[PDB]
Amino acid sequence: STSFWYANMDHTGNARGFAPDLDGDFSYAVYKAVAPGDAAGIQRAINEGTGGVRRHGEWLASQPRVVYIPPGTYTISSTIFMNTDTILMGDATNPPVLKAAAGFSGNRILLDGRDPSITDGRGELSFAVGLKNLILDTTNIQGGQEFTALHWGVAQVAQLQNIKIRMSPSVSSTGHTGIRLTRGSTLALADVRLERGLNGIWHDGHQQALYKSIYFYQNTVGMLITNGATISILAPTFETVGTGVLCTSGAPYIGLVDARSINSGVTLKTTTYPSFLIENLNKDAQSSSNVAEGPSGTILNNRAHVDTFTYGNTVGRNPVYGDTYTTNTRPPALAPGGKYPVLPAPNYAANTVADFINVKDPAQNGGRTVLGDNTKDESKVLNEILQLAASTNKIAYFPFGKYRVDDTLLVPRGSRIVGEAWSTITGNGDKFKDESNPRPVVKVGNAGDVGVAQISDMRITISDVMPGAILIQFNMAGSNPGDVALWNSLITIGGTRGANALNSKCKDARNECKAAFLGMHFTTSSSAYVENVWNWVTDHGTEAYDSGSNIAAKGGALVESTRGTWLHALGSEHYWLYQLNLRKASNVMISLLQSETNYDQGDNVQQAPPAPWTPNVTGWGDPDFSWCGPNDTRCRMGFSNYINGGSNIYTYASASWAFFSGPGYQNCAGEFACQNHLHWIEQAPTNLQAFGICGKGSWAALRLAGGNVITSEPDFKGGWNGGGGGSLVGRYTP
Amino acid sequence: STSFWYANMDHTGNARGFAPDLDGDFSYAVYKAVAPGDAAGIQRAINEGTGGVRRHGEWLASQPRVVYIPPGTYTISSTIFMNTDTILMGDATNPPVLKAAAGFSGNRILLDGRDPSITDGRGELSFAVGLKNLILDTTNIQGGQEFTALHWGVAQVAQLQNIKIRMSPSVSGSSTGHTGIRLTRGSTLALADVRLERGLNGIWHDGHQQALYKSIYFYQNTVGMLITNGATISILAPTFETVGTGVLCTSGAPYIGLVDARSINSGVTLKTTTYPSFLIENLNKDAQSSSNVAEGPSGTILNNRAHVDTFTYGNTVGRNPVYGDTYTTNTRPPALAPGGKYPVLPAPNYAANTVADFINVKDPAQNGGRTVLGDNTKDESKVLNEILQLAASTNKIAYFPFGKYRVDDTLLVPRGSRIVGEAWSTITGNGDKFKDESNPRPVVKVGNAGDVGVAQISDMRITISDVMPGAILIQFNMAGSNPGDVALWNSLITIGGTRGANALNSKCKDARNECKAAFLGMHFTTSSSAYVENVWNWVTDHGTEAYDSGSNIAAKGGALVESTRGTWLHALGSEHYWLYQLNLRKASNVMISLLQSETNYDQGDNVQQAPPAPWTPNVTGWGDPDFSWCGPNDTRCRMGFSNYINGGSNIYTYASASWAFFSGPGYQNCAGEFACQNHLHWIEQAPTNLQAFGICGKGSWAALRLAGGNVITSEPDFKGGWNGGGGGSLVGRYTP
């Protein structure tokens, strides 16, 4: 066929992806190839399993399927339905066209990312749906009819990579929609080009999403926002677009940062009362329309350049809801050239198999035997292959598997790592059980390293209760932002097969297991780029087994870097003390942080935090909760944002939700009574620019360093459920 | 070509069904016919509209589609998706077989009743999905694989009529297998007269809010009904033949009602691994059914007895352990239960009747040379009263093709009437004759006072087109010689929410001044004896058909029952009325197998017009609650009742699905889990021989209020039902 690197990798033989924990099935095919032009074969490859048994729906990581679609045109006559943990991989050298037929029958959706096996449309459970190197075409459908090329009501670990959507020109209240997001909890939509139609993206009640580097080309409306909580749009381009962003319902947060307007109309228009920010908008001469318009008329007139304009709930303003214009000079290390760094996930479209090292092939990795079946320690053998590929400038390809490591797996300078449907590194052993000497499972460079370390399509996890485990630690800094990067990956604790020892020790809410020390760590001399990454302590089982979810992992993400750190849609959920900790960091940019308090915590918790952990304030910057009464359990809940000093902190959207008050999915007292403090500033940083700090079920919308509290009600409401339990700090620029 | 009455009705010409208010489309075809054996044509007929435009999804009543499927076998290779306001009508003289192909591709669902155009899996909005005279067959699929013949995550006005589901035999030792009817998220009313053959599960009730399963035949199922979570389950007159386990509840804490059940060579009748509240009344077992009747987490609950009178195991009023067993004996009145069994009747399909036995009300050659339009352009009261008397006096069935028949006076349904519609043909009241609340007048009158005879209506809709404070939408006056002679099946009674009522929708857009749209939805007078099954009594809460929908409506009362003869309510949904949803005013001999209700959404702490306003209560004349016990600004107390029982005798209620959701206009949240309402179920005067079971509630502080003023609090001992007790009430037994 072609020379596309993935299709030419060994998918038979010993170097193929191998799936353990499949109930004795050692013949399951991770890889399937569709015949050229075989449109019916796309759905077949998605669902087909071993010996005629259909694949499991709703599973997260153990039964992955990558469907290779060769170049060509595939005429689609009815909706194609994805499965969880499934990737459609078109040929990157010549992406295939999935074209809707003229006689398209059924629901007017070309591709549905939501697994049909989920009941009651729970998109927040449709994890790990991937689309790569595809062209969606609906030009055979009349532009006046309602149609949706892609329904993206999905959850985390879902990804878009090198996707193009051609639609018919709009006519009419109905028309083509490129990507419609209904119920779901996804993280990032990256590098999608939407051509024509009525709506390029329709955000219909999706909780939150970061839209990174989206190209809106000749859309009647760039993004339609009907309902939803937190919307972050980073580095978009509006070319011949009638209206950039149109929000006709709800009170969400809308973040438009580093936007470009090419011969377009109004950039942000709303008929309701959302809180939005426009930072670094650059308009051309043909874009002569107002920048912002609302129910009362013009909000911001025609300006070719906008610095920092908010219109929403702002701290210190009389009245709270209103306009504010400021100018801020971004640090050149954070924003080279005034623009924050945005990079597409690598697809290696021009690379062939020779540019890679298949870690399992003895002819490629230096004559080493690698299993990836979670039956033995493979740390040393994998540290040697990773150092070999970096020293020879080869990309290290991990076929799918579960690679058990009993010591740190170092990612050395010059590494480019890519996996097959989130190949899994799992830590194990006594070397990660010393909480007095915490140890990284995956270490990205040594202390003081400068170089390239790019990782994509991987998973890191643990197999036992390991109170000293740091799942990934970033030590290396890049020469340019993105040299050290992590794309489209997940870091999980529990919830998946392959961790029996961990699964047996975490079934008691009275003694929550000390599974890990940290999920992610960014050391002081590091400089890392993170996009579409799920940092998740399990709340429920995903792969049909008694999963146990009473886990006390101390901290989710600890950022100590003073060089520069960019977090594009990082989901950090269900850790004990905090989801995001900024400990004396000095150059941090956050385009979206998605977080959720641990479900076992709240008024009816059985073990009050910080227990079972003893906080180390001096050594690791833990919150000690010494301000709460020893039995004030609404006060002793994990923080979503714990900002502790430092400088040059830019956060542009925080989707932090509280749902329950204790084990068993117990309800909270009220809409704003699940938690007291989700967002907490311990020490005021120098040059802090915070926008879109959203919450759910929190009494306070933000806590300031001196102890002052910004209450969610009555004037800092918004976002989740339009304010029915939702917090919104649209502007905090102290 | 057969002699089926519906397929041989005029579907061209002037007597065809006509859909008004379709944005200038006067050629829309309500009726579509599938070619024999054309499986692909079934989906086409569901969605096809005028001139290549697809039909509207989610719509309730204005764009109906009836799909006629001739006899034959239809090999289905992928899931068929229904639409709202859509009926699949197989040939009643020879039902067609919808057979899943051996190479079935997709999610492994043969037929999905839930409209795919609804977003976020909201089955509670999938209204008016009908299936008639069909055989669903999954025998080409191996019995060891998970498969679902019918997904019924739907909402009210959905109906099953003469449906049989054949499945492959389950595999011994296998946890997966065929499921006949799976109910996920949704709010349907009744599933009637379905025969389920083989498979692993005949019915899987997976989180559905509530459902009445009437006259279900479980034939050789490994498990009759599986219940994984849910609130209120009522099973009336089932038959378990060669069934391994009758009812198996492995998750949740629902209410399960088993009444008039038959066991033929079956295993355990009700087994649970959790703590639901169930009732088993009038279970009659054969000799070969030697298993225990009920089994729970602690072991045996009720051992093998061939006959069970009244056994409850749940939250019971007056018990010192609230949760526990109770055995009593009750002699049902012969007028309520002739022969000891409650009356259950299938909805009439007229399978043996031809066109000659019918009167098409629009055909001048059949109705006496009268001009009938059905386009909501003029008053058609006199012309329709004369046709109904004509069809009754000539022993003919009156067939209403679809339309909107405006009436400016009462439309009398006389003695001997049999009325059937085409996808819920609509009678809409109008005029000044329904606007004098001091002289309320029925829109549709079922017989005169003191009449005895047959008056059977099915597949119809009754509504109003303006604000009519004196309008009774349907009033039952006549009694039957046998129960079911006066009956109403598979219908809707709606106020607002649908196109065709511009004057009404324009006057009901202010929550500060709630419009007095109607006096009563349904009325059962003292000398009446009516049978009601699968009927939606609905004051609108939101718009359904893409139009400016005013939903700030104060319709006084939903259903007022004053009858002292027999009255049977099988899955009556009464929703969003102002003062009450169901009022039993000195009624005698009343049987309710399931009542589904919802408090008006504008009511609660943040209400803008405190009840009884804008209504002045008439306690003496009409038995309204005046809410004089509440402080004039205690707004959680001044909320509409779901059950308002006021005196009388011989009242048997077996399931109450009564939900409160919001605290004011705008879908505002409530103060707490049990803080939406104070009283959902209220006894004003204690009746003689009152037998109450399965009184479920949501978000109300009290689970039940007694005549003396004593209150049975939902917490701590009467939790259960909705969300397993997380805000759900459950009075499993109140038998004073």
Numbering used by the authors:
A (entry chain A): 17 to 187, 190 to 752
B (entry chain B): 17 to 752
Text taken from the publication that reported this structure:
The glycoside hydrolase family 55 (GH55) includes inverting exo-β-1,3-glucosidases and endo-β-1,3-glucanases, acting on laminarin, which is a β1-3/1-6-glucan consisting of a β1-3/1-6-linked main chain and β1-6-linked branches. Here, we investigated the mechanism of endo-type action on laminarin by GH55 endo-β-1,3-glucanase MnLam55A, identified from Microdochium nivale. MnLam55A was identified from extracellular proteins of a phytopathogenic fungus Microdochium nivale, which infects grasses and cereals and causes pink snow mold. NMR analysis of the initial degradation of laminarin revealed that MnLam55A preferentially cleaved the nonreducing terminal β1-3-linkage of the laminarioligosaccharide moiety at the reducing end side of the main chain β1-6-linkage.
The crystal structure of MnLam55A was determined in unliganded form at 2.4 Å resolution. The solved structure contains two molecules of MnLam55A in the asymmetric unit. The entire structure consists of two β-helical domains of 3-solenoid connected by a linker. Each of the domains is composed of 12 coils, which each contains three strands and three loops as observed in GH55 exo-β-1,3-glucosidases. In MnLam55A, the catalytic site and subsite −1 are formed by Glu-140, Gln-172, Ser-203, Trp-552, Asp-557, Glu-591, His-592, Glu-614, and Tyr-617, the aromatic block is formed by Phe-143, Trp-552, and Trp-554, and subsite +1 is formed by Gln-225, Tyr-617, Phe-677, and Phe-678. These residues are spatially conserved well with those of exo-β-1,3-glucosidases. As the plus subsites for the binding of longer oligosaccharides, the aromatic residues suggested in SacteLam55A (Trp-196 at subsite +2 and Tyr-194 at subsite +5) and those on the putative substrate binding groove in PcLam55A (Tyr-135, Phe-199, and Trp-245) are not observed in MnLam55A. On the contrary, MnLam55A has an open cleft, extending from subsite −2 toward the nonreducing part-binding site, to place 3-hydroxy group of the d-glucosyl residue in subsite −2 toward an open space on the cleft in the docking model. The cleft-forming residues of N-domain, Trp-75, Thr-135, and Leu-141 of MnLam55A, are conserved well in other endo-β-1,3-glucanase sequences, which suggests their importance for the formation of minus subsites. The smaller size of C5-L3 in the structure probably allows the localization of C6-L3 appropriately for the formation of the extended cleft and possible subsites.
